[PDB]
């Protein structure tokens, strides 16, 4: 038999119904007090599944016609808008499954544009691409038929005025205060109102030194060639002072009194530095020179090497009988190089703070920045092209496949450098939210104590 006591199946699940009858819900029963978690907690998202589109690339051209039309063309753009995140999408397109993102070709085009997109960013170009196909720095002064005479918009012939006015100044011998070298990622670093370029004829840039630049001046500087030599000195960034800082251990965050063993190894560094020739004990938490700090990381993670040289009862012996892992400090500095400048728009800007000494990235003029990127892509190529561990390391995304190829022990190392960097951030964040003084009482007393 099949028992049934009645008043059982309602014919509609008991949620969508009153005792009997489905109930009505019309966005007026609902409050706006739900949906107010949106101010912090973001709404649901549809993460697209990553595709190596080779299934869509049944044949050749459609695969090498989106290399440009979709991959390269996203670099010409990023080599124009923000050349610092030009290593971010190189990860974005290789996490998505693409093949030759860090190939010896994509970089040597990314660095090509990054180098030149500067000299047509100072020329006044606002969009790097004219149409789907060609670049706007190749619109010739005919319809398309002129040889090299660039179609100079009014913005340009006012960007080429500011350049010419900067030339005449240092041609007068004065200091060439080029306007767009106070121009950074936030606009004028000087906190001034941005001077917008199609400048009104009733707001002409006036320098009380008597420098004349007008339309009669810049009209002959039409084609690409006679500016790359005339304003060579300004459109070109300088790569000398940044030449090798990415190929060198620098940990802008990490302090001398900060190590994974917070005391044990630094007790050795104080022990070596009292029984020393030129001995100096450590109370000043002031940062030690960069290269000696990365030694302890190469001497604090592996309890192998923590004791392997802790036995050493002299100063330089520990400081210099470990050059064998100092031959390993680049293979880790190639890791702290990628994963630093990779993931978020913030990790990269915080990264350049350490290496190229940008106190604040947001105020360093573009001339100083495009260089550091140019000096950073110039050493991405070194890593990808010169040494064999560079390719796979680039195409590695997780740690599991990262540990395999390059030094398994070398990955033990910096994952206690990164874990030490981030734990310094732990000091700042949780540093704010640990002072508890609230109560019903002391929150009253904290008024009068605030009164004086």
């Amino acid at each position: 038999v099949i028992s049934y006591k009645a008043g059982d199946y309602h014919l509609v699940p008991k949620k969508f119904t009153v005792g009997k009858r489905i109930a009505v819900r019309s966005y007026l029963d609902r409050n706006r007090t739900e949906l107010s978690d949106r101010t912090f907690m973001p709404q649901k998202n549809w993460f697209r599944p990553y595709d190596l589109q080779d299934g869509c690339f049944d044949r050749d051209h459609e695969r090498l016609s989106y290399r440009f039309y979709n991959l390269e063309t996203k670099v010409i753009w990023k080599a124009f808008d923000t050349p610092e995140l030009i290593g971010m999408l190189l990860h974005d397109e290789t996490v998505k499954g693409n093949s030759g993102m860090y190939a010896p070709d994509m970089l040597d085009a990314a660095l090509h544009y990054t180098r030149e997109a500067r000299y047509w960013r100072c020329i006044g170009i606002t969009k790097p691409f004219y149409d789907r196909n060609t670049l706007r720095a190749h619109c010739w002064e005919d319809n398309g038929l002129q040889v090299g005479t660039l179609v100079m918009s009014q913005a340009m012939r006012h960007a080429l005025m500011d350049l010419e006015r900067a030339v005449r100044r240092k041609e007068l011998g004065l200091e060439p205060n080029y306007l767009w070298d106070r121009w950074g990622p936030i606009g004028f670093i000087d906190g001034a109102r941005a001077d917008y370029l199609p400048r009104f004829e009733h707001n002409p840039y006036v320098d009380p030194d008597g420098v004349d630049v007008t339309e009669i001046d810049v009209l002959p500087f039409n084609t690409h060639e006679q500016i790359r030599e005339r304003y060579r000195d300004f459109i070109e960034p300088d790569t000398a002072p940044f030449e090798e800082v990415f190929r060198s251990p620098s940990h802008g965050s990490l302090t001398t009194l900060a190590d994974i063993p917070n005391a044990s190894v630094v007790a050795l560094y104080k022990d070596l530095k009292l029984k020393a020739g030129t001995p100096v004990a450590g109370d000043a938490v002031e940062l030690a020179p960069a290269d000696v700090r990365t030694l302890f990381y190469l001497s604090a993670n592996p309890e192998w090497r923590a004791v392997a040289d802790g036995k050493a009862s002299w100063e330089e012996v520990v400081d210099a009988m470990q050059p064998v892992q100092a031959e390993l400090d680049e293979k880790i500095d190639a890791a702290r190089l990628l994963q630093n400048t990779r993931h978020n728009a913030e990790r990269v800007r915080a990264f350049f703070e350490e290496k190229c000494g940008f106190h604040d990235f947001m105020y360093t003029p573009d001339k100083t920045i495009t260089a550091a990127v140019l000096c950073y892509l110039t050493e991405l190529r070194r890593i990808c092209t010169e040494t064999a561990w560079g390719a796979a390391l680039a195409k590695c995304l997780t740690d599991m496949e990262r540990v395999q190829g390059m030094g398994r022990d070398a990955f033990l190392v910096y994952r206690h450098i990164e874990d030490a960097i981030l734990d310094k951030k732990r000091r700042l964040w949780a540093g704010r939210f640990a002072g508890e003084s609230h109560e019903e009482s002391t929150l009253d007393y904290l008024l009068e104590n605030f009164g004086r």
Binding site: N31, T33, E34, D37, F40, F433, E436, E439, L443, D444
Partner: protein, 309 residues
């Protein structure tokens, strides 16, 4: 600081509530928190400025105008604080039109978004952390289980996890009442009506804010009454007798017996409760006359809810 709320009193009558600590207007309009919209005035479907049809709770008060000013300060409010992650009161912003105070909380995993500001809160302090007690610290957002009888809580959420709806107005507070029900806690809403709130509901501990609103806020300036702009509220007894039954009369006619807005609003008649929730225990009518304290004495169970309404 003297008295974190002041009746600032620019003109001897014009008393607006300045609070020392109030953030200057510059640090108010925040981009991803600022909503703007035209408010429909009192116009509802077919323009036609009109209230609501008798039975409904969607307000288009006939006498409403300039509800969203367009360049007035309008930041959105959280109403859903998170349970026990520490806060950090960064500033205390005071919008006149939305009389509420509201201060920006960092909330300790970056969320520079939280507003409702309980009374006696100071800026630049951490709040959501409990002291030795259960969660008895002013500003700490407490589930209704964690409160004990007789202590005020504000921004109580009506349905658990559906955002704080009760006791949001300045200086207001829902008092717990120590009920006998198994998994429910009755709160004496300020309307003197008690309601069987689910104990898992979240409330923010303390009073609400900005005491000295109940009185002591009096504009009496033609420019300053643009904190509350509304349409003129004409006499109902000078309304073109063809139009409104109270009208004409060659002088001051007192008014008709049964007052009526357009349909009826007789003085205590029109009571417009039409659906009572399962949680409601005693409406404001069942308590309107007793007192504030006597309602705080009893224990409230399901047998206290009157089977007839």
């Amino acid at each position: 600081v003297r008295s974190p709320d002041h009746g600032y009193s620019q003109h001897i009558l014009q008393k607006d509530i300045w609070s020392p600590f109030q953030v200057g207007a510059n640090m108010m309009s925040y981009t991803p928190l600022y909503y703007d919209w035209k408010g429909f005035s009192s116009r509802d479907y077919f323009g036609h400025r009109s209230g609501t049809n008798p039975g409904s709770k969607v307000l288009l008060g006939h006498y409403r105008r300039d509800e969203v000013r367009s360049w007035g300060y309008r930041i959105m409010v959280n109403h859903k604080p998170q349970k026990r992650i520490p806060k950090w009161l960064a500033c205390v912003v005071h919008i006149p039109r939305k009389k509420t105070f509201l201060g920006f909380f960092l909330y300790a995993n970056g969320a520079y978004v939280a507003e409702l500001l309980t009374y006696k809160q100071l800026p630049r302090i951490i709040y959501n952390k409990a002291f030795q007690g259960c969660l008895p610290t002013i500003g700490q957002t407490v589930s209704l289980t964690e409160v004990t009888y007789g202590k005020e809580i504000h921004s109580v959420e009506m349905y658990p996890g559906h955002g704080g709806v009760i006791c949001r107005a300045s200086g207001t507070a829902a008092v717990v009442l120590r009920g006998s029900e198994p998994n429910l806690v009755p709160l004496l809403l300020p309307s003197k009506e008690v309601r069987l709130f689910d104990n898992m509901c979240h409330a923010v501990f303390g009073r609400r804010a900005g005491v000295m609103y109940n009185k002591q806020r009096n504009f009496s300036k033609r420019s300053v009454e643009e904190n509350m702009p509304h349409r003129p509220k004409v006499h109902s007894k000078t309304k073109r007798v063809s139009s409104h039954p109270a009208g004409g009369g060659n002088g001051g006619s007192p008014n008709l017996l049964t007052p009526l807005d357009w349909r009826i609003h007789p003085r205590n008649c029109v009571k417009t409760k039409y659906w009572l929730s399962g949680y409601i225990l005693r409406g404001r009518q069942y308590n309107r006359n007793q007192t504030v304290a006597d309602l705080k004495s009893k224990t409230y169970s399901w047998a206290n809810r009157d089977p007839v309404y």
